[PDB]
Design a protein around this ligand. Sequence first.
Ligand SMILES: [Zn+2]
Ligand SMILES: [Zn+2]
Lengths: 109, 105
Amino acid sequence: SDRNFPNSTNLPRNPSMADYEARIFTFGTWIYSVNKEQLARAGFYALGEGDKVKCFHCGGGLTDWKPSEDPWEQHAKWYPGCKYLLEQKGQEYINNIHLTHSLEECLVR
Amino acid sequence: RNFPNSTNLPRNPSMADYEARIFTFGTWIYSVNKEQLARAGFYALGEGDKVKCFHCGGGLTDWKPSEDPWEQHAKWYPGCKYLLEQKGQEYINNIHLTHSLEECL
Ligand SMILES: [Zn+2]
Ligand SMILES: [Zn+2]
């Protein structure tokens, strides 16, 4: 189905990609300019069409990576409720990416 | 993009008062209640069923018949500060726990 609504429980949506090495493999043909090792470690595998990656745990998708963007920071911006993210980076990171993004908000606006 | 605001100050302070909002829905002709949407912070964008919350800047589209507008506001923009002020935290969480029940079917 790959429903739009992400997965903020602990059961990894696509469990067949819970392995790291299974993921960096999907970046075999990766031409885009974000670091693929930093990518997979952040929980992403490549969908093989364009630059679309999905997360293996929350099923969250990302596109149009601007060059040298951080997979980790990006993961937490759009899906602040991913359990594997919470596992890896811990709440403050998640609250920080958001806190700074709530800042260049009102900074002028 | 872009990033909806978890922040406390609204994004379109002009669509703050209810009366300004329902005015967008003067033409509105969809199977979703117009007077419910406006109550929920939303204003019509003119094109399609596309509506937007005045406070967070969330946009919702492809509406289905009888879909509760309050529910969706919570579903897609939980960090919305106006939503919170109108429904309390618990309500928002109920929607998320109910859709996490879906996650195992
Ligand atoms: Zn995730
Ligand atoms: Zn809102």
